[PDB]
Design a protein around this ligand. Structure first.
Ligand SMILES: [Mg+2]
Ligand SMILES: [Mg+2]
Ligand SMILES: [Mg+2]
Ligand SMILES: [Mg+2]
Ligand SMILES: [Mg+2]
Ligand SMILES: [Zn+2]
Lengths: 125, 134, 94, 136, 38
RNA sequence: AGCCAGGAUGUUGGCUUAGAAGCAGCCAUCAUUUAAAGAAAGCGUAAUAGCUCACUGGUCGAGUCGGCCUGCGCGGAAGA
């Protein structure tokens, strides 16, 4: 398991790619094999995107590091984060075609401009 | 949805192929001759993994993969048999140009980010059969 | 830096010591240097957890007796024959 | 099997086994089997236990046996009256008092040693414990 | 039902349960593993 | 602790064997994507498939894990 020092290092890692990423979408990752998700790590590394599955009370303290503070209620339920550090968008298009093609999970509520974009309206990004 | 490793220009023996892919509802000779006509380009004496994708209507589509890191470092180290005791005994040498060639073949087959990732995984199948990287 | 707490012993010998050990303390001694040797008692548990670390043997400790710190080093230890316990300890003033 | 090559005397007084042990400490290996109970070990028993812990380590590391069966023991056969002389020497024993260290070992992990001395202990008549070497 | 003075857990699935002042070993996996002390 | 999800790639690692494909045996036991996934802990196949385990994310919501020293008990304990 993870030491307190580990979790500290990881709040620092996700906070450091947080302050540096333009668009961040939070989704449900559940019901998916490591095959299809290694495929969203290939289409994630190819789209300039940072793909992570991180603890929710760890993402509360990593998101408290601004301006993602409106996502703390999308942290109840399984949580995977796509940070596009290079480009905005290219996460919210890829997660909806991944979620429509696999017919699994959600892609629930995202973050851009310092704001939360709801499930139906991330069609902006 | 069965996976095989079958010699390059060869198919239809009873113990290796017929039972293992044919008890799943799949044509034996259609697969045999379409796989020996697709893999007639693979070098002689290389088993090539073929992933047989079988459907509820018994007609299939197969993805022929590239010859294994094990078998491609068997042919590129010049060897026949890898080490029966790996990294204890060293049976041949594959230069890093052949690790990047076998990991461009396996770049067609892998999960690697960069040719560094795939050449380090074929580095691992180079140390797993005892073959030195030189 | 390990800190041991101790009182001077008012009696001596087999009886005093066996009583002391029944009561879950044990006797020790501090000698060396210029002064006269000092007979003290210790709380068994405390010192058994302190000597649980090898540092205890190679380091200068501080023994507080009557509010007074003497700086010592571990010199020698008698242990009970089969039990995990401490029979007695020599400290040399360091 | 252990037994003195040659002795000054052939037979010996019964003796009493009293007091505590000398050599209660681990002078060689990292680990030890200490004797908590009190009694004689026959040579045969020493043999068995040694063979067990040797089995356990898969013939790794190194073992010492810190007890030797020097005292001769005597027995009269069946259907024999009293007196008529001292009995013949059947076997050897070592007299063990609580605190002694019979077996030492090193060149092996802690866990493995705990298990080895356990399996060796099963073949011994005296209640025994596991000790670790201490600095000083 | 092996019946003896020494009873253990002979796999991960074994369970030590005392019924009526008797120590027992109940297994999910293995009927050979059922043990009663006595 | 229990419930939901995953437990992948090179790969069927080499050797060997009619077959060894994590899972007869011998040896290496690396690296990738990774939240996590051992060249796999047990069951399984002719060899495969398959069922779980190690490990992780979700849910839950406050204690919990196993050693030590001891006090008194339990089994061990069948006869005219
Ligand atoms: Mg007296
Ligand atoms: Mg003596
Ligand atoms: Mg839990
Ligand atoms: Mg009784
Ligand atoms: Mg009866
Ligand atoms: Zn069982």
């Amino acid at each position: 398991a993870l030491n307190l020092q580990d979790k500290q290092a990881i709040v620092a890692e996700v906070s450091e790619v947080a302050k540096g990423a333009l668009s961040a979408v939070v989704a449900d990752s559940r019901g998916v094999t490591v095959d299809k998700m290694t495929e969203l790590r290939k289409a994630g590394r190819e789209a300039g995107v940072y793909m992570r599955v991180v603890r929710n009370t760890l993402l509360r303290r990593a998101v408290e590091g601004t301006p993602f503070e409106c996502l703390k209620d999308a942290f109840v339920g399984p949580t995977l984060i796509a940070y596009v550090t290079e480009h905005p968008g290219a996460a919210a298009r890829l997660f909806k075609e991944f979620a429509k093609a696999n017919a699994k999970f959600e892609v629930k509520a995202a973050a851009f401009e310092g704001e939360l974009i709801p499930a139906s309206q991330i069609d902006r990004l | 949805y069965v996976k095989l490793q079958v010699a390059a220009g060869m198919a239809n023996p009873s113990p290796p192929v017929g039972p293992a892919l044919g008890q799943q509802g799949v044509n034996i000779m259609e697969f045999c001759k379409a796989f020996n006509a697709k893999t007639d380009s693979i070098e002689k004496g290389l088993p090539i993994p073929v992933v047989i994708t079988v459907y509820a209507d018994r007609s299939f589509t197969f993805v022929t993969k590239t010859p294994p890191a094990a078998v491609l470092l068997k042919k590129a180290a010049g060897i026949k048999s890898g080490s029966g005791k790996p990294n204890k005994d060293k049976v041949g040498k594959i230069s890093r140009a052949q690790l990047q060639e076998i990991a461009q073949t396996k770049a067609a087959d892998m999960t690697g980010a960069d040719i560094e990732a795939m050449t380090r995984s074929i580095e691992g199948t180079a140390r797993s059969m005892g073959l030195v990287v030189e | 830096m390990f800190t041991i707490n101790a009182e001077v012993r008012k009696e001596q010998g087999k009886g005093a010591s066996r009583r002391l050990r029944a009561a879950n303390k044990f006797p020790a001694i501090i000698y060396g240097g210029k002064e006269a040797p000092l007979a003290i008692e210790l709380d068994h548990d405390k010192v058994m957890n302190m000597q649980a670390k090898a540092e205890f043997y190679s380091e200068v400790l501080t023994i507080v007796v009557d509010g007074k710190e003497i700086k010592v080093k571990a010199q020698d230890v008698q242990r009970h024959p089969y039990k995990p316990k401490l029979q007695h300890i020599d400290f040399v003033r360091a | 099997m252990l037994q003195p090559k040659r002795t000054k005397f052939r037979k010996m007084h019964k003796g009493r086994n009293r007091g505590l042990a000398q050599g209660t400490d681990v002078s060689f290996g990292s680990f030890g089997l200490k004797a908590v109970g009190r009694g004689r070990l026959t040579a045969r028993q020493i043999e068995a236990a040694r063979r067990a812990m040797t089995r356990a380590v898969k013939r790794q590391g190194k073992i010492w046996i810190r007890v030797f069966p020097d005292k001769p023991i005597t027995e009269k056969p069946l259907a024999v009256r009293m007196g008529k002389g001292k009995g013949n020497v059947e076997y050897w024993v070592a007299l063990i008092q609580p605190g002694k260290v019979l077996y030492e070992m090193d060149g092996v992990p802690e866990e493995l040693a705990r298990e080895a001395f356990k399996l060796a202990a099963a073949k011994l008549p005296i209640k025994t414990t596991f000790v670790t070497k201490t600095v000083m | 039902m092996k019946v003896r003075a020494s009873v253990k857990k002979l796999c991960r699935n074994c369970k030590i349960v005392k019924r009526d002042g008797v120590i027992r070993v109940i297994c999910s996996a293995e009927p050979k593993h059922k043990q009663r002390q006595g």
